[PDB]
């Protein structure tokens, strides 16, 4: 709850190859009714994912 996300930024984020973190970037982010935030994630080879916000990490 202490990452600061915004779209456009680089993150690490779960893999779609294995689930382990690879370096991705954020697309968008979206807030809905429940209060729940996800961003939509996109990946080197351009593949997209719905990601909750708390499941990304910061790059080292």
Known sequence: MKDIWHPG???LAPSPDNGKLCE???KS???DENGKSFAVVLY???QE???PLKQLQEVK
Do not use: M, P, W
């Open 9 to 11: 930024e680089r993150c």
């Open 44 to 46: 080197a080879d351009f």
């Open 29 to 31: 982010i979206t807030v």
């Open 24 to 26: 991705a970037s954020i």
């Open 49 to 51: 994912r719905k990601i």
